[model samples]
Target: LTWHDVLAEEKQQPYFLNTLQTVASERQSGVTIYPPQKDVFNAFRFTELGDVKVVILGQDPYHGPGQAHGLAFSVRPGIAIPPSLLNMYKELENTIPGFTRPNHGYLESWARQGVLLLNTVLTVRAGQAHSHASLGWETFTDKVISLINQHREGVVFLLWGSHAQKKGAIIDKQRHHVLKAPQPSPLSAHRGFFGCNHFVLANQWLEQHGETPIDWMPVLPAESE
Candidate 1:
């Protein structure tokens, strides 16, 4: 299971892939992914901030209308990101105090604040059969590990459960200082999938560190600066 941008053939290597499409596109259906516009990493200089203090890597996008572009997590893509996402977002927004529907900008604002959202398999095909059969996720995970390891240490990693946790090999779970919370999905945020709870556990961690809305997400830590 490795992922790479389908357009990466020129580099002699891949950069991203979809969950099913490309990896098995012809067999499956309904997937959407966008490669970097001009051979830039992170699609949009996303790594420019350096070491991505806090990363919220997710599964994938909504695969709905107008969201085929890579900027979907923000919902501002017009026509709603996707039907699956629409249903999921509506179901989950109620759990958060002030989350708004179709307002993808909020997700973007967090990036500047120390919150970064990304999908594990960066891109996938849509419309017709996906190009899956040849795709691999194992390779993509390696890219993730390389990115995380390149940084010195002590980077804040907030893993949701299931899809996110599946990539939890590198993180040092022993140190509470590392701060690992349960998934934030509407269903899991409250109960948590395993040990770490999302609900107040995550909120309290942020609040204690001063990431509350009042202070912005300044909770990343001054030392990690």
Candidate 2:
């Protein structure tokens, strides 16, 4: 089935619908939520299910204003790049040749190239991390992982940090390339994430499997002459 179908089906499920309602209720009660409203599904929208070749599972959205546009670890243009994402760029700079860090943290280009930057929990309350942890988002996102594991073969799954690695336990290692490393947070990047070389390895696996390797660089809009 198409990604749209998967989203449509999940939208009808009680857990998914309930999650939306809860987020709405939280919003009405003056709790600020991230990702604004329309961009909640940007990951799925940018990368169609059929085109999904790599999955980078994240914990949740950024718990700050002007950050978190649905895609995991991504902030909108003009927002300061977060520490974790900056570490990601550092890793990419080391692993991928000619990779340049962009001024912005937006990763829509990666999503368009079949990288599903999915966070385990989609929405979060501003100024608070993991505030929505038990709001049923895990159930929905777990289904997303399970679906790709069951239907897609030879996809790459990048599970960074212990939490993401745990969530990736359901992935079929025989069917997908599951790469595990320390999370690229500044706190742990020095441990293993820095030299993991996931970007190069992911592209290598993708090429060997006859799929197009993702262009891991974040492209910025051209400057006006």
Candidate 3:
């Protein structure tokens, strides 16, 4: 869809808002809410509309407000951190001791290119209300992997932490590749989430084969129990 047209129609459609709305507040909570953050204008729109096969699954929508504002499975692209994620970054920076704000934003920035940051639970009441942590993504992730097995041969999935890893089983190994990345959040710090640059390996693969690729150089297992 045309960005211009869709943006104009944002108000009409069920756009994902920040803490300003009842639904979003339950998703991501921030200290002080801002207008654009609350408005639909700042939300991400997944403009890339081709045969979407591979996906990057993420946890629930962000609770805090800031750059992280959008639908759980954003129908747009660009930017990162929904309100909840933003708030997580905020708290992470403040309470997590050494973590910094830029690093938090950096986490969102890194995933933007190859990530779909999908939340299993679309919308909740307020503040971590409806969740699966592992539950929500369960249903839809199947849809994602099924498509990959059908069309995009050799699609690589970036499963970011334990929560997102639970959904990795849907992937059909015969059709594509599933690469595990350390959760960029502080929660999975020891795993070297953000410390290891994802794109570096991805770019190297593409340069050789011209598609999504990852080496087993330090392949990490999905955090499944």
Candidate 4:
């Protein structure tokens, strides 16, 4: 019936449960929110507690209609890949040889492989960026990151852009590895995103720690065939 109900099976911080319930009550007053009601907790569903190996912080969900499926920088299949995501694929190609861009931008593959693609703001008004920035979602995500910092160690955190980078202040560098770079948006990707081989660096760290390295080599159609 509500986001709280949808995420009832998942264990969340009490503050998170209260925040989501409050958001649910507000939406009952008739306001449009992206990601649909059912998909609001897709990020948590994809990456669960004690399952995260890496964290990629996004500022907010895409504000476009039919975009923003709860995972940062991800959209449903059949949706045109956003410019930032396309630029990410370009960087992936440059970082890893033989890495081909996928036709769709679902990115659930990365999530399943232990990438916690979390956005700072969980919801936004369609076509209106930052519409939900002040709606308490940032508080929730800040808590989420802080909790991760407290409990999870040796996790890789990719703080892209200034907004995401700022959130990294809460993370202890002595515990987790933090990688900061320019925003991957096409407008800024050429500045510093080009040379940051984060994917490789993350895997290398994991390998060094005796943890299993993530198979970032996407299994595109050609590989499947």
Best by lDDT: 2
Cα lDDT tens digits for candidate 4, 48-129: 8577899998887898777888899988777899999988889888887678877787788788888998999887776778
Per-residue lDDT of model 2, residues 28-119, tens digit only:
89788987779888898898888898999899799899999999998888999999999999998888889888788988889989999999
**Candidate 3 lDDT trough over 10 residues, lowest sum:** 213-222
**What TM-score quantifies how close candidate 2 is to the native fold?**
0.95
lDDT string, candidate 3, 79-169, tens digits: 4534434543443454433555542232323223443445544433334444323333334334444544554555556576776667676
Once model 3 is optimally superposed onto the true structure by TM-score, how far is the C-alpha of residue 86 displaced, in angstroms?
A: 9.6
Number of the candidate with higher lDDT, 1 or 3: 1
Candidates in order, TM-scores: namely 0.54, 0.95, 0.50, 0.86
Candidate number that wins on lDDT, 2 or 4: 2
What C-alpha lDDT values do all the predictions have?
A: 0.44, 0.89, 0.43, 0.81
How would you order the candidates by lDDT, starting with the best?
Answer: 2, 4, 1, 3
Off by over 4 Å in 3: 1-54, 66-68, 71-114, 129-137, 194-196, 211-225
State in Å the error of residue 100, model 1.
5.5
lDDT of 1 by residue, 1-225 (tens): 112332235234443434433444533444434432231134234333342445555555434344433432444323434443443355345445565564432244455554445665544455332232135544654455445545424345556656566676656654322444545455664564333433334455556655552212112212553
Clashing pairs in 2: none
* TM-score of predicted structure 3: 0.50
